[PDB]
Every structure is written in structure tokens, then in C-alpha cells.
């Protein structure tokens, strides 16, 4: 069980620890500890705090969503699958056509 993920550090927070801070902008935000809340107030950019999970991902020390470059799995050609024409007959027609074309 987890309480959530810390906004600044990127660290996952155990059940029964940490605190929420609610701003007048109406947003609610979760912090791991007083340490990282204070760094937010003082406008220290998280990417510069080298032990944070955020910083490590940004540097590419840790594999993260940005590294993935995912793409759809490519398939091959099929024996012309077309309405009515049974798959097996096209396997035969295509051959017969190739013969006549020569």
C-alpha cells in the first residue's frame, strides 16, 4: 500500500507518512518530507538535486517513459483476403495469374 507519489522528488510515499499541501489556486499536492517542500518554496529546480528520481530520469541514469520510442508491431502480407473469395482459392488464382502474366 502507498499514499501516492511525491510531486517534487518523484519518490513513492509509504502509507501513513508524508503530507498534502493545498494552495489557494485550488490544487492539492503530495510531498515526501519537509525537505522537499522547502526546496519548492525556495525555487530550487528538482533536476539539479541529483539524488531525486526526477533528476536521475532527466539525466538518463534511469530508464523512463521518454527513452522508449515505442512503435506498432509490423505484420506481413497475407494470401489476398477479400470478401467471398475463399482464402485457398486466391492462393490458387494468384499463382495462375502470375503464370499468365509471364
Amino acid at each position: 500500500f502507498y499514499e501516492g507519489t511525491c510531486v517534487y522528488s518523484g519518490y513513492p510515499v509509504p502509507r501513513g507518512k508524508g503530507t498534502y499541501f493545498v494552495s489557494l489556486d485550488d490544487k492539492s499536492s503530495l510531498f515526501f518530507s519537509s525537505k522537499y517542500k522547502n526546496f519548492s518554496d525556495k525555487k530550487i529546480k528538482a533536476k539539479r538535486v541529483k539524488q531525486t528520481l526526477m533528476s536521475k530520469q532527466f539525466c538518463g541514469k534511469v530508464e523512463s517513459v521518454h527513452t522508449e520510442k515505442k512503435k506498432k508491431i509490423v505484420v506481413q502480407k497475407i494470401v489476398r483476403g477479400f470478401p467471398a473469395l475463399p482464402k485457398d482459392a486466391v492462393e490458387k488464382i494468384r499463382e495462375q495469374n502470375k503464370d499468365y502474366k509471364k
Partner: protein
């Protein structure tokens, strides 16, 4: 929670309710994740499924590229999923949507079965269906007409495909016979009209080109007469 399953080899669909334990084993996943059927049901071993999309219980869609467990409002144009503009071009509007990460919010998950393997899923495996329309374009039609890389009059292929329909479907009948038609191939009416444009350009040339010489016969001093304004 509902689960909606598609089987794209067969063209078939089935919806089921999940139980709590099945549901709780899906939490944390996202669209374009995969899993093994064994995590949803006993048996179903080795059946591989892929997650497609779904809906919040409030009715908002899950979006494929918003990686969070929360609702947002986005400004959406034409061609974005979740918005359907109609009566003004260039319209853009702000609508509530949900991120891709699965949790207790979700009312329905859509899923595709990649391959049924040796298993016999009811309704998905018991039926095979085709398409809805027919390839109007010539080269798309030709491939379906079984031919490749040879030259025919369209009439040949229309004959082949019609005869095969009469034979293979009906064994003789006036049923079927959908109104097959062909694009992107020149009919005789087009041969004539395409010849006529050649006639136009050939005369317009000679007529234009004649008058130039006809003018110069009369006016050797064209430039010196004209230019003195």
C-alpha cells in the same frame, strides 16, 4: 465493470462482467498494455490480450496519450478523439477527459484478443464475417480479383467477380450482385474527351503563332512607333 472483447481475425464481439478479483488485477495498467488471459479467468492460458481504451463512470473517455489517473480539461481541435465539430470550420473547444491509467473510476475497458490459439471462446471463435463495402478503385479491385501485375479491361474482372458470386455464393441467383463499379480506369467517353483537349491546344498554338507574323508584315517599326508616349 464491463469488459468488451474484439477478435479481429473473425470480426466478432463479446461483452462480459468482471468480478472484484479480476478487476483488481487490471488496476495500474494502461492502453497498449498486454496481459495473459489467465489473469482474468482460470484457464485461458497463453491467450494474449491488448488494452484498447474505455470510459470513466461519469462518461468521459480514456485518452491514449494522457498518462495519469486523473481528469483534465483540454482544448481540442477537429481530428482529436473525444470531440466532433460540425457547423463551423476552425472551431476548437474545451472538454473534460480522463488519463490512460486504470483504476476504480472505470466502467468499461475495451480489449483485443491477438490469437485464440487452441482455446474455444464462445461467440468469438464460432463465427467468421467479412467486410461491409467493396473496393471501387481499380487496383484495389484487381488484387481482390486475384490477379497481379498483368493488364486487363475492367469488363474481364467485373465478369470474373460476378460469375464467381453467382457460382460460389448462390449456385445461381439474382441475390447478391452488389452494384460493382470502377474508378481510376479510362472508359471510352474519357478516351474521346481526352483526345479533344489535344485538338484545342494544337489549333490555339497555330492561331496565336500566325497573327505574330501577320502583324510583322505590316509593322516593321512596331517598337519605335509604339514606345514614344
Amino acid at each position: 465493470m464491463k469488459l468488451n472483447i474484439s477478435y479481429p481475425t473473425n470480426g466478432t464481439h463479446k461483452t462480459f462482467k468482471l468480478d472484484f478479483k479480476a478487476e483488481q488485477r487490471l488496476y495500474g495498467k494502461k492502453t497498449l498494455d498486454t496481459f495473459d488471459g489467465s489473469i482474468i479467468k482460470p484457464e485461458w492460458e497463453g491467450l494474449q490480450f491488448q488494452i484498447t481504451g474505455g470510459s470513466d463512470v461519469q462518461g468521459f473517455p480514456m485518452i491514449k496519450t494522457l498518462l495519469t489517473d486523473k481528469r483534465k480539461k483540454l482544448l481540442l481541435k477537429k481530428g482529436d478523439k473525444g470531440f466532433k465539430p460540425v457547423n463551423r470550420k476552425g472551431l476548437r473547444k474545451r472538454k473534460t477527459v480522463r488519463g490512460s491509467i486504470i483504476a476504480s473510476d472505470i466502467s468499461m475497458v475495451c480489449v483485443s484478443l491477438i490469437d485464440a490459439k487452441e482455446v474455444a471462446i464462445e461467440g468469438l471463435t464460432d463465427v467468421v464475417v467479412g467486410a461491409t463495402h467493396w473496393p471501387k478503385r481499380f487496383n484495389k479491385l484487381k488484387a481482390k480479383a486475384g490477379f497481379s501485375e498483368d493488364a486487363d479491361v475492367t469488363a474481364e474482372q467485373v465478369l470474373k467477380v460476378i460469375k464467381d458470386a453467382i457460382l460460389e455464393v448462390n449456385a445461381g441467383g439474382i441475390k447478391k450482385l452488389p452494384k460493382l463499379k470502377v474508378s481510376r480506369y479510362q472508359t471510352e467517353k474519357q478516351k474521346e474527351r481526352k483526345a479533344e483537349k489535344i485538338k484545342l491546344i494544337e489549333e490555339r498554338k497555330k492561331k496565336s503563332e500566325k497573327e505574330r507574323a501577320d502583324f510583322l508584315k505590316k509593322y516593321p517599326d512596331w517598337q519605335k512607333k509604339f514606345a514614344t508616349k
